[PDB]
Amino acid sequence: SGFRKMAFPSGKVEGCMVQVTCGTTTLNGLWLDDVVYCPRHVICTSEDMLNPNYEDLLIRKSNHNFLVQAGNVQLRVIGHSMQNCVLKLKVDTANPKTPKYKFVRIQPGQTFSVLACYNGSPSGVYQCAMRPNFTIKGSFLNGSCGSVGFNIDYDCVSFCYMHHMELPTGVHAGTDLEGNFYGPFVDRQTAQAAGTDTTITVNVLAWLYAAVINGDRWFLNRFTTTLNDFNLVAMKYNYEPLTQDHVDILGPLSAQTGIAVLDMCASLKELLQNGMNGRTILGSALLEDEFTPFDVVRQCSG
Amino acid sequence: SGFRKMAFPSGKVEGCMVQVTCGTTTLNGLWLDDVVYCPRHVINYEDLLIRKSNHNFLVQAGNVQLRVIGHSMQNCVLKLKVDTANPKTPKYKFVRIQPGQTFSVLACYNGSPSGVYQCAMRPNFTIKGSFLNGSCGSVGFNIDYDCVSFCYMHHMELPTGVHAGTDLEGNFYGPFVDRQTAQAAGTDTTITVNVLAWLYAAVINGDRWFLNRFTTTLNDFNLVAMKYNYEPLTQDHVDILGPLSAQTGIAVLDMCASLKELLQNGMNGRTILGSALLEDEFTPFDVVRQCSGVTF
Ligand SMILES: CN1C(=O)N(c2cncc3ccccc23)C(=O)[C@@]12CCOc1ccc(Cl)cc12
Numbered sequence: 001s002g003f004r005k006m007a008f009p010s011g012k013v014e015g016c017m018v019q020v021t022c023g024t025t026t027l028n029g030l031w032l033d034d035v036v037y038c039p040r041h042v043i044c045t046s047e048d049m050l051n052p053n054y055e056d057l058l059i060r061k062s063n064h065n066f067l068v069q070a071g072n073v074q075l076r077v078i079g080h081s082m083q084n085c086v087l088k089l090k091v092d093t094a095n096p097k098t099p100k101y102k103f104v105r106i107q108p109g110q111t112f113s114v115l116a117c118y119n120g121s122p123s124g125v126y127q128c129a130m131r132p133n134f135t136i137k138g139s140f141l142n143g144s145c146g147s148v149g150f151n152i153d154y155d156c157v158s159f160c161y162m163h164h165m166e167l168p169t170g171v172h173a174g175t176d177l178e179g180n181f182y183g184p185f186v187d188r189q190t191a192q193a194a195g196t197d198t199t200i201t202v203n204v205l206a207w208l209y210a211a212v213i214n215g216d217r218w219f220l221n222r223f224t225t226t227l228n229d230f231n232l233v234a235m236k237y238n239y240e241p242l243t244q245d246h247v248d249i250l251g252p253l254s255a256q257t258g259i260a261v262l263d264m265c266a267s268l269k270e271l272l273q274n275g276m277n278g279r280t281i282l283g284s285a286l287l288e289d290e291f292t293p294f295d296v297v298r299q300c301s302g
Numbered sequence: 303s304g305f306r307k308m309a310f311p312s313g314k315v316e317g318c319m320v321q322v323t324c325g326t327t328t329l330n331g332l333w334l335d336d337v338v339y340c341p342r343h344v345i346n347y348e349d350l351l352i353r354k355s356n357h358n359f360l361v362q363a364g365n366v367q368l369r370v371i372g373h374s375m376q377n378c379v380l381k382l383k384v385d386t387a388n389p390k391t392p393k394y395k396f397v398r399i400q401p402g403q404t405f406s407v408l409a410c411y412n413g414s415p416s417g418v419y420q421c422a423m424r425p426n427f428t429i430k431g432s433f434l435n436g437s438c439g440s441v442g443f444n445i446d447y448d449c450v451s452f453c454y455m456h457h458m459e460l461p462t463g464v465h466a467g468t469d470l471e472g473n474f475y476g477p478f479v480d481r482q483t484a485q486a487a488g489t490d491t492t493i494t495v496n497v498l499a500w501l502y503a504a505v506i507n508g509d510r511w512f513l514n515r516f517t518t519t520l521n522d523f524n525l526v527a528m529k530y531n532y533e534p535l536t537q538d539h540v541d542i543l544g545p546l547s548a549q550t551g552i553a554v555l556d557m558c559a560s561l562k563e564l565l566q567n568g569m570n571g572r573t574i575l576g577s578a579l580l581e582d583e584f585t586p587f588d589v590v591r592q593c594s595g596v597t598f
Pocket residue numbers: 041049140141142143144145164165166167186187188189190303
């Protein structure tokens with residue numbers, strides 16, 4: 001019993017964190033096999049932040065301009081290439097601690113763990129969700145660039161995020177491990193703003209099923225709804241549209257608790273209308289949207 | 303910017319998790335140097351233990367079986383002497399924590415780490431964890447520089463879904479015993495110094511709506527706090543909050559008047575750091591660590 005915001009154990013990722021220094025900029029790199037992946041903005045100077053020409057800045061760099069530190073050991077850079085917004089530094093040593101890994105690009109609503117690092121040193125681990133507006137509500141200070149988001153399947157680490165920047169609202173933007181940004185963001189200091197954020201509906205429903213599995217039924221009601229009527233109500237509270245894919249995804253939790261997805265949608269409509277009335281659901285006074293249907297099954301069942 | 307419930311990186315502890323099997327029971331063990339620490343319920347514990355031989359305890363570290371060469375009991379923890387010192391043993395200490403202190407929990411099943419979360423030792427000595435069958439032996443810890451301070455070992459779940467465990471010396475936190483019997487968590491209270499620390503974290507992150515011009519005496523605050531099932535705030539807590547008070551320019555008794563207004567009037571549709579409830583599982587140290595960037 002119990003329901004916590006749970007991160008994956010970070011050990012497999014900690015053994016990959018390195019410090020990358022180019023000129024005055026220092027940030028984090030991900031050392032997998034003989035390559036160090038880091039945000040390409042590590043090559044940027046003071047007058048380069050607004051309109052950097054990364055191809056032009058990179059061609060002027062030599063391997064010895066990139067200082068890579070793994071613990072108290074300096075790795076020797078023997079090559080460099082750019083792939084979208086990530087810089088790939090070929091090093092002369094394969095990381096002996098390289099786990100079984102994959103680069104996966106995630107969709108909004110998907111969750112992952114963040115290993116926050118400064119100067120190639122892991123300082124903390126927490127759980128995140130890719131917001132529908134493609135930002136993440138992280139916990140990052142200056143020097144956290146290059147910190148990574150990941151999930152762990154069996155013994156395999158799926159790297160899904162690399163931290164690049166903070167938007168003016170305090171939310172965070174970054175790329176997948178192939179350097180493709182999530183959202184309409186660019187690695188420039190030009191005026192950028194996160195779009196209006198919405199609640200991840202399928203995740204709230206998954207969390208309502210987690211509450212039912214943990215013995216909380218107070219929010220359930222005798223009603224059901226059509227998917228269309230639920231979406232008409234949901235959009236009014238800035239909730240993401242619930243698709244037939246989401247209904248299908250919620251099938252196992254529905255079978256386990258005996259509460260049909262559209263029946264759970266009717267509880268959610270009522271919670272949106274009434275609020276909680278001094279009550280909590282799984283120790284929360286707000287509807288939690290950073291647990292996927294997959295997280296609920298993993299945590300509540302195994 | 304940002305404020306998240308953040309756990310310590312778990313790598314140093316993951317390299318210590320082993321599976322312990324005795325008869326039909328399988329749970330987790332903590333392998334440090336040549337000893338595997340695990341809950342004694344894996345086996346009258348003196349009478350049950352004397353009937354066991356070393357080969358009755360099957361200890362598995364990855365796909366490698368460690369051979370048990372000795373066994374002794376210390377309070378509610380079983381110490382299995384093994385033939386091999388764990389090469390991954392980090393610099394460590396066994397520390398007993400006080401209620402209100404936080405720690406990271408590496409939840410394990412069959413000696414395999416599955417998740418990490420940040421917890422607080424509730425004033426009623428329980429933890430509001432997330433544990434399923436097989437999680438026994440999962441450990442709580444903090445990291446100070448490169449030293450892992452082991453502070454908790456999971457033993458059981460109470461009927462309310464909350465958890466009970468011991469320090470690494472086998473001494474239970476709270477009035478609990480390791481047996482299937484009628485046990486209940488006492489009435490819980492809010493960790494006041496931690497709520498204030500979290501209110502300072504909100505100020506550091508740009509949330510000031512709850513601030514007011516008012517101040518209070520420590521006595522008046524404790525009279526109000528006692529009414530709302532909040533732990534008494536001591537002069538030690540006020541002193542501990544000193545750095546955050548200096549950084550934000552809000553005296554501790556000034557934040558206490560904010561907390562008093564929040565307790566009597568509520569949030570009024572508003573949130574603080576994305577929460578509609580007053581969060582009490584971040585200590586003043588956690589707030590400073592997260593709002594400064596301390597690494598391990
Ligand atoms: C070099 N940068 C950088 O390290 N962060 C930051 C990341 N994450 C959290 C932070 C918190 C406090 C200050 C800066 C933080 C940025 O946002 C920034 C500086 C600001 O403009 C940009 C623009 C583009 C790009 Cl890709 C990076 C940046």
